């Protein structure tokens, strides 16, 4: 088998993405973040307390016949940027861009925090990271991915964000017309639960590449691009009058410049990003200073490449028996 899915900004500047996710019988619709750096499949609900929803669409356990109690289990995660969700679990029928599964956990958030509540675009997260993160207890339960996988044609899926622009989620296949040149394999460790790889270094705009080890994780529920504090201040110190600002959290540029691009590699190869990708626009309405999109990961304690960087590539998460990532110009 396999599933095809378009994946969709929530706005004007690529905060995150959403994908049509079907739920139960008769089928429920909900609009879900995909995170390669998280493994749960949560979702606003009947059970979420009234006052934190505002405007998402809500999965009804009760209205689905294929719905069944996950009886004890609970769940209860917090992400990096400090949000959280918690509640108990169903199984239910799920599928995504064609690709079923049954018998998927679906975690029923009974509270959010105001983060979620405040993005009426985001119905809940499908997590795509390896199961052993997973929250729910006392029995850990595995993402779609990990259920899907014994049923598709090859055990994969393949992220291709937009900028600006829609953008596709495939299970099960690689496209091989929706990029450009070769797909470079690079190693991955699970032993945090993420696809965690090694970059082999970087340039700003036109420099000369600089060969040095990044590892960092693969991340399409993270916005921007977390790097160390040497290779973001190397970015920054290119664009005149930016800064760090510790009142706004991080790297601020005057919206008057044009970024320079910065390339990253993937063995051998290299993905460059456009300076464009890297302005996140004015830091409040109507403000002539921007934020940019490379930030620093020293206050976090892993490197994230997130949206600003995936969206640059084709990127192939294989879950095979020895996972790897590959990237390809697109």
């Not at 995150?16 to 879900?32: D, E, K, R």
């Not at 105001?114 to 207890?137: C, H, K, M, R, Y």
């Not at 496209?175 to 790889?197: L, M, N, P, R």
């Not at 959290?249 to 990708?277: E, K, N, Q």
Request: proline share 4%; with cysteine.
């Amino acid at each position: 088998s396999t599933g095809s899915a378009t994946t969709t900004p929530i706005d004007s500047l690529d905060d995150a993405y959403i994908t049509p996710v079907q739920i139960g019988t008769p089928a429920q619709t909900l609009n879900l973040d995909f995170d390669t750096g998280s493994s749960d499949l949560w979702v606003f609900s009947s059970e979420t307390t009234a006052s934190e929803v505002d405007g998402q669409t809500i999965y009804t356990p009760s209205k689905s016949t294929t719905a069944k109690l996950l009886s004890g289990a609970t769940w209860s995660i917090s992400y990096g940027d400090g949000s959280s969700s918690s509640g108990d679990v169903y199984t239910d029928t799920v599928s995504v861009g064609g690709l079923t599964v049954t018998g998927q956990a679906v975690e029923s958030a009974k509270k959010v925090s105001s983060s979620f509540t405040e993005d009426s675009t985001i119905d809940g997260l499908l997590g795509l990271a390896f199961s052993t993160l997973n929250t729910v207890s006392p029995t850990q339960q595995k993402t779609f991915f990990d259920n899907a996988k014994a049923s598709l044609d090859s055990p994969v899926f393949t992220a291709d964000l937009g900028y600006h622009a829609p953008g596709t989620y495939n299970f099960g296949f690689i496209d091989t017309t929706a990029y450009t040149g070769s797909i470079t394999y690079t190693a991955v460790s699970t032993k945090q639960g993420f696809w965690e790889w090694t970059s082999t270094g970087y340039a700003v705009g036109s420099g000369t590449f600089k060969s040095t080890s990044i590892d960092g994780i693969a991340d399409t529920g993270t916005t921007l691009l977390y790097l160390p504090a040497t290779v973001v201040s190397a970015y920054w110190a290119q664009v005149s009058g930016a800064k760090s600002s510790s009142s706004v959290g991080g790297y601020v540029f005057p919206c008057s410049a044009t970024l320079p691009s910065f390339t990253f590699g993937v063995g051998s190869a290299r993905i460059v990003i456009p300076g464009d990708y890297i302005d996140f626009g004015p830091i409040s309405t109507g403000s002539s200073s921007c934020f940019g999109g490379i930030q620093s990961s020293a206050g976090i304690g892993i490197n994230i490449f997130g949206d600003v960087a995936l969206k640059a590539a084709f990127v192939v998460f294989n879950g095979a028996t020895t996972p790897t990532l590959g990237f390809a110009s697109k």
